[PDB]
């Protein structure tokens, strides 16, 4: 999955079959980094509109 | 005690197995904080269910 | 419907050779111990021999010695028996019978003997 943004660490637990997760709007809530098992989620560069 | 070829001599415990048939249907699925399915609604099951 | 077919009968010249063979319908011929029973004209039944599921152990009765050989062919579904000589024993009717005692039945510590369940049609040996 390709994107633009910042990456923030998190401790969201996941089911055994899928380390990757999807949000309730089916957006990627968190995708696990391949080399490092730490949970890393995408946060936009643009926060709530100024 | 009885010979193998005859039906007798193959005694086992009393076990009952269920068989159902799948028909195409549309089911809403409810997940939970941890990510496991807890409740479902079948549309054809009831007018309330619809 | 289980049926064992006898063959190789008829009166021949007495001595030195005679062919017997017993077939078996279905695919349950192999792995079942089989015995040959000869019916005397007026003296009751008698024994010939016994062969196991694989033929490793074979045993013969005391009535005849050194004249009988028993073998089973798995593919042809027919068991073969041979008499190397023909003695004064004439007009004897030979049956082939299947006994359900399988390898597993004597493999288990249990010491059990079943009965000769199904028999053949019979044949004439002179
Ligand atoms: C991947 O392999 C490199 C060596 O090529 C190693 O230094 C690195 O720690 C490895 N990472 C993982 C995922 O174990
Ligand atoms: C989630 O899993 C934890 C495991 O310790 C359990 O204690 C908790 O009750 C579960 N919560 C839900 C919403 O099932
Ligand atoms: C029993 O099994 C044999 C195969 O060993 C099969 O040929 C036969 O049709 C079966 N049923 C009957 C009628 O005994």
What are the structural domains, with CATH classification, of chain C?
Answer: 4-125 (2.60.40.10)
Tokens of C82: 């041979």
Tokens of C2: 């289980």
Give the residues across from B17 on adjacent strands. none
DSSP B44: G
Burial of A9 (0-12, 13-18, 19+ CB in 10 A): exposed
Radius of gyration of chain A (CA): 12
Other beta carbons within 10 angstroms of residue C50's beta carbon come to: 16
- Write down the number of H helices and E strands in chain A: 0, 3
DSSP of C31-96, one letter per residue? Answer: TS-EEEEEE-SSS-EEEEEEE-SSSSSEEE-SS--SSEEEEEETTTTEEEEEES---S--SEEEEE
Q: What is the resolution of this structure in A?
A: 3.9
Distance of alpha carbon A9 from alpha carbon B38, whole angstroms: 29
Nearest residue of A to residue B36 by CA position? A15
Q: DSSP H helical segments within chain C, as ranges? A: 103-107
How many residues are given for chain A? 50
Tokens of C46: 């008698």
Q: Are C100 and B4 in contact (CB under 8 A)?
A: yes
**How many CB pairs below 8 A link B and C?**
15
Residue of B28, B30, B32, B35 for testing the chain A interface, max A β-carbons within 10 Å: B35
Residue C10 has phi, psi (to 5 degrees) of: 95, 160
> CA–CA distance from C14 to each of B46, C19, C86 (Å)?
89, 13, 6
Q: Which residues of chain B lie closer than 8 angstroms to A14, CB-CB?
A: 35
> CA–CA distance from C58 to each of C3, C48, C76 (Å)?
24, 11, 21
Tell the residue nearest (CA) to atom 4 of ligand 3: C26
């Amino acid at each position: 999955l390709t994107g633009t943004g910042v990456l923030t660490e998190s401790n969201k637990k996941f089911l055994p079959f899928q380390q990757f997760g999807r949000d309730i709007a089916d957006t990627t809530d968190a995708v696990r980094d391949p080399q490092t098992l730490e949970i890393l989620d995408i946060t936009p560069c643009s926060f709530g509109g100024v | 005690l009885t010979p193998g070829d005859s039906s007798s001599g193959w005694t086992a415990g009393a076990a009952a197995y269920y068989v159902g048939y799948l028909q195409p249907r549309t089911f809403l699925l409810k997940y939970n904080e941890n990510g496991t399915i807890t409740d479902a609604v079948d549309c054809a099951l009831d007018p309330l269910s619809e | 419907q289980v049926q064992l077919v006898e063959s190789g009968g008829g009166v021949v010249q007495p001595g030195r050779s005679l062919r017997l063979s017993c077939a078996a319908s279905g695919l349950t011929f192999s792995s079942y111990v089989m015995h040959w029973v000869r019916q005397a004209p007026g003296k009751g039944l008698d024994w010939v021999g016994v062969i196991w599921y694989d033929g490793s152990k074979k045993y013969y009765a005391d009535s005849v010695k050194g004249r009988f050989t028993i073998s089973r062919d798995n593919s042809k579904n027919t068991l073969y028996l041979q008499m190397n000589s023909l003695r004064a024993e004439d007009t004897a009717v030979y049956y082939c019978a299947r006994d359900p005692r399988d390898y597993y039945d004597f493999w288990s510590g249990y010491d059990y003997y079943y009965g000769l369940d199904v028999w053949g049609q019979g044949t004439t040996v002179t």
